[PDB]
Amino acid sequence: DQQYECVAEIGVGAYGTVFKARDLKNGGRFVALKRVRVQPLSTIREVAVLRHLETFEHPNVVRLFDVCTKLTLVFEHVDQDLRTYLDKVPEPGVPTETIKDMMFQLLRGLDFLHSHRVVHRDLKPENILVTSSGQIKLADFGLAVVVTLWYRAPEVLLQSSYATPVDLWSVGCIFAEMFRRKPLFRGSSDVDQLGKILDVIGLPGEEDWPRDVALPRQAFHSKSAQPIEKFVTDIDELGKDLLLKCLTFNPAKRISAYSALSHPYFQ
Numbered sequence: 001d002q003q004y005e006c007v008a009e010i011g012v013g014a015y016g017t018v019f020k021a022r023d024l025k026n027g028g029r030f031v032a033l034k035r036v037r038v039q040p041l042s043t044i045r046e047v048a049v050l051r052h053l054e055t056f057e058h059p060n061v062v063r064l065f066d067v068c069t070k071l072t073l074v075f076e077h078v079d080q081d082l083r084t085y086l087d088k089v090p091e092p093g094v095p096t097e098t099i100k101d102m103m104f105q106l107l108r109g110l111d112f113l114h115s116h117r118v119v120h121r122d123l124k125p126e127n128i129l130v131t132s133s134g135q136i137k138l139a140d141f142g143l144a145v146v147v148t149l150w151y152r153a154p155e156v157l158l159q160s161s162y163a164t165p166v167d168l169w170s171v172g173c174i175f176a177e178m179f180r181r182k183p184l185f186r187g188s189s190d191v192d193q194l195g196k197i198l199d200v201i202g203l204p205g206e207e208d209w210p211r212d213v214a215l216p217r218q219a220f221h222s223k224s225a226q227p228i229e230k231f232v233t234d235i236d237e238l239g240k241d242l243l244l245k246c247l248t249f250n251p252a253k254r255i256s257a258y259s260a261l262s263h264p265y266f267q
């Protein structure tokens with residue numbers, strides 16, 4: 001494509017590469033140019049879902065400017081991710097109302113995706129973008145040290161389920177991280193990540209542990225659920241309630257993005 005000039009590599013990329021490029025036909029604005037290889041109905045369907053979502057132009061998801069044919073996806077460029085934002089915020093950290101605003105915007109973007117049956121499945125500060133105006137935009141969904149591990153829901157770690165609640169667990173981890181400015185659960189393997197989660201939330205009821213999984217409840221020896229204020233010190237009463245509703249072991253009992261939008265923490 002001689003309409004885009006690649007200036008820097010944003011990353012890779014299970015089946016392609018993403019570049020920061022100059023959009024030569026639209027005033028030379030920056031775009032995130034993703035080139036995806038093909039070896040396919042599964043892939044065609046996924047890009048149709050992406051194009052359909054773009055018709056709504058939701059304020060909390062990145063704009064998809066163009067799709068070209070081996071597949072070129074052109075998105076609006078955002079200068080920073082939430083990881084970079086949190087790394088640069090000076091002491092004593094992110095202001096209370098800014099944490100509230102960013103979390104509300106994040107849940108609005110996720111509620112949009114979940115209402116159109118799209119599950120992000122890889123929600124982390126690296127793919128939550130922060131615009132120059134302070135707007136939160138979700139990115140890197142709908143296709144296909146491992147930072148991903150730290151935001152994985154117990155049901156993904158156990159290999160039991162992958163429904164919309166998976167993203168609400170990641171929201172909970174990110175919410176706690178907005179205050180801490182360090183990951184809540186920093187594990188080095190699937191089993192270890194689950195162990196570190198249960199050391200904080202405690203062992204769930206025996207009936208809440210999923211059936212037909214390799215890791216039984218008996219493999220974890222967490223004595224008690226610790227108070228979340230020990231790990232998230234500046235969090236208020238309402239924020240604590242919303243956080244624990246996100247960090248609920250059983251995905252059926254976990255708060256949805258829709259209900260989280262109505263939580264008294266945002267009133």
Ligand SMILES: CC(C)n1c(C(C)(C)O)nc2c(F)cc(-c3nc(N[C@@H]4CCOC[C@H]4O)ncc3Cl)cc21
Nearest residue numbers: 011012013018032034062075076077078126127139
């Ligand atoms: C990097 C990662 C989350 N990413 C991946 C893969 C598959 C590698 O995970 N695909 C990606 C993709 F298609 C697009 C973007 C994207 N990036 C920016 N800007 C970036 C943000 C990070 O700081 C440098 C800036 O240039 N703006 C808008 C968009 Cl939409 C990021 C992607």
